[PDB]
Symmetry: C3
Subunit: 119 residues, 3 copies
């Protein structure tokens, strides 16, 4: 999987980025069985003031986690993996759950390349 | 919904970002019935010269709006919501429709978390 | 199509960005038949140290290519287009295949707007 993680600049020190990528990655391997090195976490920073909720401009505390997964996971599984990302990122970032969004997009495995190799 | 809005740095003042998030958000609630606060608009700026159309490098006037929606919307509806985003962003940004791209990705609601809560 | 190409800041000079957008674009038109000007390549740069593989922090050499396509392409086709992007970007960027990830997301054409016009 590839987890696109959208945060504001300077809300996560370099040591907290690592804790959030670690939390996300572990949650994914512990609940799905996909090996460690197959989970990419790509942080996308933006300046404070680039997030809007109901047309209202936010500060720096929002995190949107967008996971791009292979298809074929029960709804039960994907829900557990979402809740666990919310909780684990919440601690690993020192941020309340309310500031944490999690979306999953699914793809056929045969159009999914990691390390230059197909799944 | 979450609308990832991809623009070049310094093409939208802070007051125009707000107008575009407002336009997008209103279009979504007026056509779908999802409440205001449930629509995130996340602007993603990049330097001028990071967009290519047919391998040809562009300036700062392109906007790509990528909406991430819950599944289960008629094709008629999604088309109206796309046209309305094109038109409303065009005015709210002072930019011609030709410079505006709009893509929607759909997801099951049960893998969709906002404010730390499932849909 | 729209190809979101995620790289680290200052790993691609401006002249290499153009070669990668050219490689991607040509691969897409040669294998699908979609005309040139319909392929957007949007580079998304981030600072070195924003990519994590298995919770381990990377330098600047990773490239994630995320294509957003219209639905309805055989699996055979999408695989050829993925391999060809891997190989062609590898040369056009001077980067080993191992550092290159490629994911495709598919959408209904009727929710897909380019140049302010529906597909």
């Amino acid at each position: 999987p590839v987890y696109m993680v959208y945060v504001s600049q300077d809300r996560l020190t370099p040591s907290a980025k690592h804790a959030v990528a670690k939390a996300i990655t572990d949650a994914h391997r512990g609940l799905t069985g996909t090996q460690h090195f197959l989970a990419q976490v790509n942080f996308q920073e933006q300046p404070a003031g680039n997030v809007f909720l109901g047309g209202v401009q936010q500060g720096g505390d929002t995190i949107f986690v967008h996971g791009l997964h292979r298809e074929g996971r029960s709804a039960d599984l994907k829900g557990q993996l979402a809740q666990r990302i919310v909780d684990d990122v919440s601690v690993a970032a020192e941020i309340d759950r309310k500031h944490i969004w999690v979306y999953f997009g699914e793809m056929p495995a045969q159009q999914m390349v990691e390390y230059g190799r197909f799944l």
